[PDB]
Structure 1
Amino acid sequence: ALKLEADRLFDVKNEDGDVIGHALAMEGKVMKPLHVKGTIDHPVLSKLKFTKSSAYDMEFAQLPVNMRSEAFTYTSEHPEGFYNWHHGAVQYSGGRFTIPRGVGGRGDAGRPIMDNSGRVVAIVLGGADEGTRTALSVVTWNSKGKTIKTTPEGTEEW
Protein backbone atom coordinates (compact mmCIF):
# COMPACT_ATOMS: atom_id res chain seq x y z
CA ALA A 1 0.00 0.00 0.00
CA LEU A 2 2.11 2.89 -1.33
CA LYS A 3 0.30 6.20 -1.32
CA LEU A 4 0.62 7.07 -5.01
CA GLU A 5 -2.10 9.68 -5.62
CA ALA A 6 -2.98 12.29 -8.23
CA ASP A 7 -2.10 15.96 -7.88
CA ARG A 8 -5.27 17.31 -6.23
CA LEU A 9 -4.26 19.22 -3.13
CA PHE A 10 -2.08 22.30 -3.74
CA ASP A 11 -0.44 24.91 -1.51
CA VAL A 12 -1.33 28.59 -1.28
CA LYS A 13 1.56 30.69 -0.04
CA ASN A 14 1.81 34.25 1.28
CA GLU A 15 4.06 37.05 -0.01
CA ASP A 16 7.16 35.73 1.74
CA GLY A 17 6.16 32.14 0.94
CA ASP A 18 4.49 30.77 4.11
CA VAL A 19 1.88 28.08 3.40
CA ILE A 20 -1.31 29.72 4.64
CA GLY A 21 -3.97 27.38 3.30
CA HIS A 22 -4.83 24.86 0.60
CA ALA A 23 -6.56 24.62 -2.76
CA LEU A 24 -8.18 21.50 -4.19
CA ALA A 25 -9.22 20.00 -7.52
CA MET A 26 -12.70 18.55 -7.20
CA GLU A 27 -15.72 18.17 -9.47
CA GLY A 28 -14.08 20.00 -12.38
CA LYS A 29 -12.95 23.05 -10.40
CA VAL A 30 -9.93 24.27 -8.42
CA MET A 31 -11.27 25.86 -5.24
CA LYS A 32 -9.74 27.66 -2.27
CA PRO A 33 -11.05 29.65 0.70
CA LEU A 34 -11.57 33.30 -0.28
CA HIS A 35 -10.14 34.53 3.04
CA VAL A 36 -6.79 32.92 2.24
CA LYS A 37 -4.95 35.75 0.50
CA GLY A 38 -1.96 34.12 -1.12
CA THR A 39 -0.95 32.47 -4.42
CA ILE A 40 -1.57 28.87 -5.50
CA ASP A 41 1.87 27.26 -5.71
CA HIS A 42 1.29 25.87 -9.21
CA PRO A 43 2.60 27.20 -12.60
CA VAL A 44 -0.67 26.51 -14.33
CA LEU A 45 -3.30 26.98 -11.62
CA SER A 46 -1.97 30.32 -10.45
CA LYS A 47 -2.69 31.87 -13.85
CA LEU A 48 -6.37 30.97 -13.90
CA LYS A 49 -9.26 33.41 -13.71
CA PHE A 50 -10.84 32.91 -10.27
CA THR A 51 -14.53 33.54 -9.66
CA LYS A 52 -15.29 34.74 -6.13
CA SER A 53 -18.19 33.57 -3.91
CA SER A 54 -18.22 35.68 -0.73
CA ALA A 55 -21.37 34.16 0.73
CA TYR A 56 -19.53 30.84 1.09
CA ASP A 57 -15.90 31.88 1.55
CA MET A 58 -15.13 30.10 -1.73
CA GLU A 59 -13.11 31.13 -4.74
CA PHE A 60 -12.99 28.90 -7.84
CA ALA A 61 -11.68 28.43 -11.38
CA GLN A 62 -12.33 25.82 -14.05
CA LEU A 63 -9.87 22.90 -14.05
CA PRO A 64 -7.78 22.64 -17.22
CA VAL A 65 -9.23 19.91 -19.46
CA ASN A 66 -6.19 17.78 -18.69
CA MET A 67 -6.21 17.97 -14.88
CA ARG A 68 -10.01 17.40 -14.81
CA SER A 69 -9.21 13.70 -14.30
CA GLU A 70 -6.80 14.30 -11.36
CA ALA A 71 -9.54 15.42 -8.94
CA PHE A 72 -11.58 14.50 -5.85
CA THR A 73 -15.21 13.42 -5.88
CA TYR A 74 -17.77 14.95 -3.56
CA THR A 75 -20.52 13.24 -1.54
CA SER A 76 -23.49 14.82 0.23
CA GLU A 77 -24.11 11.84 2.48
CA HIS A 78 -22.29 11.92 5.80
CA PRO A 79 -23.73 9.58 8.40
CA GLU A 80 -22.54 10.29 11.93
CA GLY A 81 -19.27 8.56 12.80
CA PHE A 82 -15.61 9.12 12.02
CA TYR A 83 -13.98 10.73 9.01
CA ASN A 84 -10.39 11.25 7.87
CA TRP A 85 -8.26 14.33 7.39
CA HIS A 86 -4.60 15.30 7.37
CA HIS A 87 -4.28 15.33 11.15
CA GLY A 88 -6.23 12.17 11.96
CA ALA A 89 -9.87 11.44 12.72
CA VAL A 90 -12.68 13.99 12.44
CA GLN A 91 -15.91 13.24 14.26
CA TYR A 92 -19.33 14.02 12.87
CA SER A 93 -22.16 14.15 15.41
CA GLY A 94 -24.95 16.63 16.02
CA GLY A 95 -24.58 18.22 12.60
CA ARG A 96 -21.02 19.24 13.53
CA PHE A 97 -17.48 18.14 12.55
CA THR A 98 -15.08 18.31 15.48
CA ILE A 99 -11.41 17.65 16.14
CA PRO A 100 -9.43 17.68 19.35
CA ARG A 101 -8.57 21.10 20.72
CA GLY A 102 -5.14 22.48 19.78
CA VAL A 103 -4.89 20.58 16.48
CA GLY A 104 -6.29 22.95 13.83
CA GLY A 105 -4.87 26.35 12.96
CA ARG A 106 -3.20 28.34 10.22
CA GLY A 107 -2.53 26.23 7.18
CA ASP A 108 -5.62 24.04 7.58
CA ALA A 109 -8.06 26.21 5.65
CA GLY A 110 -8.88 24.47 2.39
CA ARG A 111 -8.13 20.95 3.63
CA PRO A 112 -10.80 18.37 2.84
CA ILE A 113 -12.44 15.91 5.27
CA MET A 114 -12.97 12.51 3.66
CA ASP A 115 -14.63 9.16 4.12
CA ASN A 116 -13.11 5.71 3.85
CA SER A 117 -13.98 5.39 0.14
CA GLY A 118 -11.94 8.52 -0.49
CA ARG A 119 -14.66 11.04 -1.19
CA VAL A 120 -14.65 14.60 0.05
CA VAL A 121 -17.42 15.30 2.60
CA ALA A 122 -16.46 18.87 3.48
CA ILE A 123 -13.77 21.56 3.30
CA VAL A 124 -12.32 23.22 6.42
CA LEU A 125 -12.42 27.03 6.77
CA GLY A 126 -11.89 27.60 10.49
CA GLY A 127 -12.79 26.43 13.97
CA ALA A 128 -14.37 27.39 17.31
CA ASP A 129 -13.01 25.74 20.45
CA GLU A 130 -15.72 24.31 22.70
CA GLY A 131 -14.40 22.58 25.78
CA THR A 132 -12.12 19.65 24.96
CA ARG A 133 -12.92 19.90 21.23
CA THR A 134 -13.04 22.25 18.23
CA ALA A 135 -16.16 22.67 16.07
CA LEU A 136 -15.13 23.23 12.47
CA SER A 137 -16.49 25.81 10.06
CA VAL A 138 -16.86 23.95 6.77
CA VAL A 139 -18.41 24.18 3.32
CA THR A 140 -20.54 21.26 2.17
CA TRP A 141 -22.92 20.77 -0.74
CA ASN A 142 -26.33 19.07 -0.45
CA SER A 143 -27.93 16.36 -2.63
CA LYS A 144 -29.21 19.09 -4.98
CA GLY A 145 -25.72 20.55 -5.37
CA LYS A 146 -26.44 23.58 -3.19
CA THR A 147 -23.40 24.99 -1.39
CA ILE A 148 -23.93 25.24 2.35
CA LYS A 149 -21.75 26.89 4.99
CA THR A 150 -21.69 26.00 8.69
CA THR A 151 -19.99 28.44 11.02
CA PRO A 152 -20.00 27.95 14.79
CA GLU A 153 -20.14 30.78 17.35
CA GLY A 154 -16.73 32.36 17.80
CA THR A 155 -15.18 30.67 14.76
CA GLU A 156 -11.67 31.85 13.90
CA GLU A 157 -10.76 31.53 10.22
CA TRP A 158 -7.63 29.50 9.57
Structure 2
Amino acid sequence: ALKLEADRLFDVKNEDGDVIGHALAMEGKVMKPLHVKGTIDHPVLSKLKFTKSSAYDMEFAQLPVNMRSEAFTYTSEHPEGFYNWHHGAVQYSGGRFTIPRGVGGRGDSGRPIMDLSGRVVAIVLGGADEGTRTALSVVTWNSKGKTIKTTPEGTEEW
Protein backbone atom coordinates (compact mmCIF):
# COMPACT_ATOMS: atom_id res chain seq x y z
CA ALA A 1 0.00 0.00 0.00
CA LEU A 2 1.44 3.31 -1.26
CA LYS A 3 -0.32 6.52 -0.26
CA LEU A 4 -0.54 8.08 -3.72
CA GLU A 5 -3.31 10.69 -3.50
CA ALA A 6 -4.35 13.70 -5.56
CA ASP A 7 -3.51 17.25 -4.59
CA ARG A 8 -6.30 18.37 -2.23
CA LEU A 9 -4.70 19.63 0.96
CA PHE A 10 -2.72 22.85 0.65
CA ASP A 11 -0.69 24.96 3.09
CA VAL A 12 -1.49 28.53 4.03
CA LYS A 13 1.64 30.41 5.11
CA ASN A 14 2.23 33.67 7.02
CA GLU A 15 4.35 36.67 5.95
CA ASP A 16 7.69 35.00 6.69
CA GLY A 17 6.39 31.61 5.48
CA ASP A 18 5.28 29.68 8.57
CA VAL A 19 2.51 27.14 8.01
CA ILE A 20 -0.38 28.65 9.99
CA GLY A 21 -3.26 26.62 8.55
CA HIS A 22 -4.66 24.57 5.65
CA ALA A 23 -6.84 24.89 2.57
CA LEU A 24 -8.80 22.11 0.88
CA ALA A 25 -10.26 21.09 -2.48
CA MET A 26 -13.68 19.63 -1.80
CA GLU A 27 -17.08 19.57 -3.53
CA GLY A 28 -15.81 21.80 -6.32
CA LYS A 29 -14.41 24.55 -4.07
CA VAL A 30 -11.15 25.54 -2.35
CA MET A 31 -11.92 26.47 1.25
CA LYS A 32 -9.90 27.70 4.17
CA PRO A 33 -10.69 29.11 7.64
CA LEU A 34 -11.25 32.86 7.40
CA HIS A 35 -9.29 33.58 10.61
CA VAL A 36 -6.15 32.12 9.06
CA LYS A 37 -4.48 35.17 7.51
CA GLY A 38 -1.78 34.05 5.10
CA THR A 39 -1.39 32.89 1.49
CA ILE A 40 -2.30 29.53 -0.06
CA ASP A 41 1.02 28.06 -1.15
CA HIS A 42 -0.13 27.31 -4.69
CA PRO A 43 0.66 29.22 -7.96
CA VAL A 44 -2.87 28.79 -9.27
CA LEU A 45 -5.04 28.71 -6.15
CA SER A 46 -3.48 31.77 -4.57
CA LYS A 47 -4.66 33.95 -7.44
CA LEU A 48 -8.33 33.04 -7.25
CA LYS A 49 -11.09 35.37 -6.08
CA PHE A 50 -12.20 34.16 -2.63
CA THR A 51 -15.64 34.66 -1.10
CA LYS A 52 -15.91 35.40 2.60
CA SER A 53 -18.42 33.83 4.99
CA SER A 54 -17.85 35.29 8.45
CA ALA A 55 -20.83 33.59 10.07
CA TYR A 56 -19.00 30.30 9.53
CA ASP A 57 -15.34 31.30 9.58
CA MET A 58 -15.08 30.11 5.98
CA GLU A 59 -13.49 31.52 2.84
CA PHE A 60 -13.87 29.82 -0.54
CA ALA A 61 -13.25 30.04 -4.29
CA GLN A 62 -14.43 27.87 -7.17
CA LEU A 63 -12.07 25.06 -8.18
CA PRO A 64 -10.49 25.47 -11.59
CA VAL A 65 -12.32 23.17 -14.04
CA ASN A 66 -9.21 20.98 -14.12
CA MET A 67 -8.58 20.45 -10.39
CA ARG A 68 -12.33 19.84 -9.87
CA SER A 69 -11.53 16.15 -10.06
CA GLU A 70 -8.64 16.35 -7.53
CA ALA A 71 -10.94 16.87 -4.53
CA PHE A 72 -12.51 15.39 -1.39
CA THR A 73 -16.13 14.33 -1.10
CA TYR A 74 -18.24 15.39 1.87
CA THR A 75 -20.72 13.34 3.90
CA SER A 76 -23.25 14.56 6.46
CA GLU A 77 -23.69 11.20 8.17
CA HIS A 78 -21.36 10.72 11.14
CA PRO A 79 -22.45 7.91 13.47
CA GLU A 80 -20.65 8.02 16.83
CA GLY A 81 -17.34 6.18 17.03
CA PHE A 82 -13.86 6.94 15.71
CA TYR A 83 -12.63 9.01 12.79
CA ASN A 84 -9.22 9.78 11.30
CA TRP A 85 -7.13 12.91 10.87
CA HIS A 86 -3.49 13.91 10.53
CA HIS A 87 -2.55 13.20 14.15
CA GLY A 88 -4.48 9.97 14.61
CA ALA A 89 -7.89 9.13 16.00
CA VAL A 90 -10.70 11.64 16.46
CA GLN A 91 -13.64 10.57 18.61
CA TYR A 92 -17.24 11.53 17.90
CA SER A 93 -19.69 11.36 20.79
CA GLY A 94 -22.25 13.67 22.31
CA GLY A 95 -22.32 15.74 19.14
CA ARG A 96 -18.65 16.58 19.74
CA PHE A 97 -15.36 15.70 18.04
CA THR A 98 -12.54 15.31 20.57
CA ILE A 99 -8.83 14.55 20.49
CA PRO A 100 -6.43 14.11 23.40
CA ARG A 101 -5.15 17.21 25.20
CA GLY A 102 -1.91 18.71 23.95
CA VAL A 103 -2.19 17.44 20.37
CA GLY A 104 -3.99 20.23 18.48
CA GLY A 105 -2.62 23.72 17.95
CA ARG A 106 -1.44 26.19 15.33
CA GLY A 107 -1.24 24.69 11.88
CA ASP A 108 -4.26 22.44 12.47
CA SER A 109 -6.89 24.85 11.19
CA GLY A 110 -8.39 23.78 7.88
CA ARG A 111 -7.48 20.14 8.43
CA PRO A 112 -10.28 17.68 7.65
CA ILE A 113 -11.53 14.85 9.84
CA MET A 114 -12.36 11.79 7.72
CA ASP A 115 -14.04 8.39 7.84
CA LEU A 116 -12.68 5.03 6.75
CA SER A 117 -14.13 5.32 3.22
CA GLY A 118 -12.13 8.52 2.88
CA ARG A 119 -14.89 11.09 3.03
CA VAL A 120 -14.70 14.41 4.82
CA VAL A 121 -16.93 14.65 7.86
CA ALA A 122 -15.64 17.96 9.22
CA ILE A 123 -13.04 20.73 9.01
CA VAL A 124 -11.15 21.84 12.12
CA LEU A 125 -11.07 25.48 13.24
CA GLY A 126 -10.00 25.38 16.87
CA GLY A 127 -10.29 23.56 20.15
CA ALA A 128 -11.37 24.03 23.76
CA ASP A 129 -9.62 21.81 26.35
CA GLU A 130 -11.96 20.01 28.73
CA GLY A 131 -10.35 17.70 31.25
CA THR A 132 -8.27 15.02 29.53
CA ARG A 133 -9.44 15.93 26.03
CA THR A 134 -9.98 18.81 23.61
CA ALA A 135 -13.40 19.55 22.09
CA LEU A 136 -13.07 20.71 18.51
CA SER A 137 -14.65 23.72 16.88
CA VAL A 138 -15.47 22.37 13.43
CA VAL A 139 -17.51 23.23 10.32
CA THR A 140 -19.92 20.61 8.97
CA TRP A 141 -22.82 20.55 6.51
CA ASN A 142 -26.20 18.80 7.02
CA SER A 143 -28.18 16.56 4.63
CA LYS A 144 -29.78 19.64 3.02
CA GLY A 145 -26.38 21.26 2.43
CA LYS A 146 -26.67 23.78 5.24
CA THR A 147 -23.34 24.89 6.72
CA ILE A 148 -23.16 24.50 10.46
CA LYS A 149 -20.56 25.66 12.95
CA THR A 150 -20.01 24.26 16.43
CA THR A 151 -17.80 26.11 18.86
CA PRO A 152 -17.19 24.92 22.42
CA GLU A 153 -17.02 27.33 25.36
CA GLY A 154 -13.60 28.93 25.49
CA THR A 155 -12.57 27.72 22.04
CA GLU A 156 -9.22 28.99 20.81
CA GLU A 157 -8.82 29.30 17.05
CA TRP A 158 -5.87 27.35 15.63
Scaled to the shorter chain, the TM-score interval is: over 0.9
Determine the C-alpha separation between the residues in 2 that align with 1:146 and 1:113: 18
The equivalent residue for 2:101 is 101
**Cα distance, 1:50 vs. partner?**
0.2
Determine the C-alpha separation between the residues in 1 that align with 2:20 and 2:63: 22
**Cα distance, 1:80 vs. partner?**
0.1
Per-residue deviation, residues 74-122 of structure 1 (Å, max 9, x unmatched)? 0000000000000000000000000000000000000000000000000
**Cα distance, 1:72 vs. partner?**
0.0
**Cα distance, 1:125 vs. partner?**
0.0
**Cα distance, 1:36 vs. partner?**
0.1
Where structure 1 has 5 or more consecutive residues not aligned to the other structure, the ranges are none
Per-residue deviation, residues 23-78 of structure 1 (Å, max 9, x unmatched)? 00000000000000000000000000000000000000000000000000000000
Q: How many residues align?
A: 158
Determine the C-alpha separation between the residues in 1 that align with 2:157 and 2:120: 20
SS of the residue corresponding to residue 55 of structure 1 reads helix
**Cα distance, 1:123 vs. partner?**
0.1
TM-score (normalised: structure 2): 1.00
Q: CA RMSD in A?
A: 0.1
Determine the C-alpha separation between the residues in 2 that align with 1:108 and 1:39: 15
| Superposition map of 1:61-100 within 5 A | 61-100=61-100
Where structure 2 has 5 or more consecutive residues not aligned to the other structure, the ranges are none
SS of the residue corresponding to residue 6 of structure 2 reads coil
**Cα distance, 1:2 vs. partner?**
0.1
Determine the C-alpha separation between the residues in 2 that align with 1:122 and 1:11: 18
Q: Which runs of 4+ in 1 moved over 4 A?
A: none
